[PDB]
Amino acid sequence: IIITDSPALVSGAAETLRHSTLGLTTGAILIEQNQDFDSTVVDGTGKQNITRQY
Amino acid sequence: ALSDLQVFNDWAYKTMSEVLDQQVELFNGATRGAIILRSAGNTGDLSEAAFWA
Amino acid sequence: ALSDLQVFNDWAYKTMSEVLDQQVELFNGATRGAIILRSAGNTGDLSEAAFWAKIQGLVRPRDPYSNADVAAKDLRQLVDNTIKVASGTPPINIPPSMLRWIQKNPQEAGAVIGQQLAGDTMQDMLNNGLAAGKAAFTAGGAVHDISAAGTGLMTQRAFNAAQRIFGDRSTDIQVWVSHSSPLFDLYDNALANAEQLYVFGTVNVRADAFGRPIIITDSPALVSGAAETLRHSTLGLTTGAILIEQNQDFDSTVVDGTGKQNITRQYQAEWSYNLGVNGYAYDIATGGKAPNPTALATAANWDKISTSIKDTGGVVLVTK
Amino acid sequence: RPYIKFIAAEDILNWRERWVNGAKRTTLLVFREESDADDDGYQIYKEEVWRELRLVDGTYWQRTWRENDGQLYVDDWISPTKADGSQFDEIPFVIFGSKNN
Amino acid sequence: ELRLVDGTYWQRTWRENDGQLYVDDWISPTKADGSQFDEIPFVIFGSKNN
Amino acid sequence: DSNNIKYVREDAKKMHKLWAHIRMAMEGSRAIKDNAKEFVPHPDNTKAT
Helix, strand or coil: CCCCCCHHHHCCECCECCCCCCCCCCCCEEEECCCCCCCCCEEECCCCCCEEEC | CCCCCCCCCCCCCCCCCCCCCCCCCCCCCCCCCCEEEECCCCCCCCCCCCCCC | CCCCCCCCCCCCCCCCCCCCCCCCCCCHHHHCCCEEEEECCCCCCCCCCEEECCCCCCCCCCCCCCCCCCCCCCCCEEECCCEEEEEECCCEEECCCCCCCCCCCCCHHHHHHHHHHHHHHHHHHHHHHHHHHHHHHHHCCCEEECCCCCCCCCCCHHHHHHHHHHHHHHHHCCEEEECHHHHHHHHHHHHCCCCCCCCHHHCCCCECCCCCEEEECCCHHHEECCHHHCEEEEEEECCCCEEEEECCCCEEECCECCCCCCCCEEEEEEEEEEEEECCEEECCCCCCCCCCHHHHCCCCCEEECCCCCCCCCCEEEEEC | CCCCCCCCCCCEEEEEEEECCCCEEEEEEEEEEEECCCCCCCCCCCEEEEEEEEEECCEEEEEEECEECCEECCCCCECCCECCECCCCCCCCCCCCCCCC | CEEEECCEEEECCEECCCCCCEECCCECCCCCCCCCCCCCCCCCCCCCCC | CCCCCCCCCHHHHHHHHHHHHHHHHHHCHHHHHHCHHHHCCCCCHHHHC
16 A cells, blocks of 8 residues: 555545545556656846846 | 843754655555656657557 | 057957046055955855954042942943945847947957956946945044135145044054045145245155055045035045955846847846945944945944044045 | 676766865766566566765765655665775766767 | 167067056177177068078 | 655756667667657648647
8 A cells, every 4th residue: 555645636625525545557557758858047137136037 | 241242143054945745756666567657758649559459 | 558450350359448447456455455355255235243342441440448339340242244235237238230340249249348347347346445435434533624724635734634533543544545636736736835845856756745655546436516516535544444355256147138120139247245344334224235335325324333433444534 | 796787878867076185076976777576476567776876075885775665765875895995985886988988 | 679789789678558658778688608699689580581 | 855866967858868869760660650750740730730
């Protein structure tokens, strides 16, 4: 029994709280990373200080 | 008289940041292959595969 | 001076940028330690040091026959101060498309902004230090005024007044920093000596006749007014009187903002330094956390920390 | 027995370069080690162990991170030693390429 | 500034400080033994000839 | 604590794509035709949809 406080499994509130325990076989959930990771840092002028954005 | 004296307290910068709350290190292998992780590339919004029913 | 018009290795190859017109070589040894330029960073927007005070009633008369009641005494701890000053650079519009002059040089734009910025940065450091020193000395009561007497500037009789003000410890004043007009008035008075204590070979003396050379800079902080109300400020400095301390945190970014028909390429710079005046503390509450030259040069933003004027280093003289 | 591993190009996922006594010394180097779980069945898992090669004050240390049943294991710092002792001064990991090591 | 008077080598140097030409008096360099110099210590080499 | 043993440097992340494409090129025709979507742009996106 593997425990994680994922909001997805909670799906409830107050009295009508409905926790969901789901069992998996091998390869049940498939998640591939498309390795298309963009990370730019843009900096601007015109203000009293140099600004940067991530 | 300590009132006449000058007190500076103390400070430091731990350059440490709390990361997150929930456990997310169960992802691949810990679930015994239930959830896996590859580095495959897909575009559009969808990938298909046909298996003869 | 240099022309270098004869050979053009490259177009406007560092040939001239009229980099600066004011003497700004007044730091460390140049000011005999009076204005020390250092490089040691510190955090926050201040720098506070604490040192013990002089007990005013340390020695008292004693009556052996009747000790009477022992007067209660106590010891304090003064606080030093070193404000942090922030100085930037207005956005500079580099011409991205080379503009097709006789000298076509796109990247020479930034190349020359570097040197012009260095010169103007040192100029700003010196000017802010001088203005802050004047303000602190005026707030401390270390001022003299000879404007109402005669022409308003004597050759050497002026310096004796500052010696009288600073008192018994007058030996430790090394350098007078002043505008060029007081020096030229000095020359004119010496060149026609009423009491002939000058000879043609010794009329060009740059010193103050006491072993304190006059160092000349055209700082705007040392002049104010125009015509009849024009005033020149000459301020003498001991060793370590003015502390300009860089933090070596220079920041510089070039951005391709564009947004118009033609590309827009800009330039920006940022740096900071710590300004301190010996024997005085910048009133952080009265002024600001990141003061500007208007606030730095304004009195009542400086407090006298040392008990005696002899402890603090600097005396200011106003001449018209 | 000593074993000469072969770490795939994508397996080296972290490294660090810090000067001590004015010298190029590598302080941190993390690489992934892949394997297949050994059970009685015939399904093939793919379980990974992460090795953290660290160098502190000129000494080579080592940990392995394991991951099972929703957790992340951490093992004790160890100082591998030579047959003559004296531990190590360099991290026993070399990264090569076309340009240079 | 290299000059040759009566078959003898003399020189002077200038120091310039942002437009402050400080001139030095004419000087007479000599060899190790003496006898000073007979020709200027300067050769202009070109593709054609020196 | 950091607990980021799996963190990858930014430049390594940058090189992952080139490494994967080099692996595909070495792999043969099957890998490229499986992912000819990138290498071969569609002659018309309007038809491509």
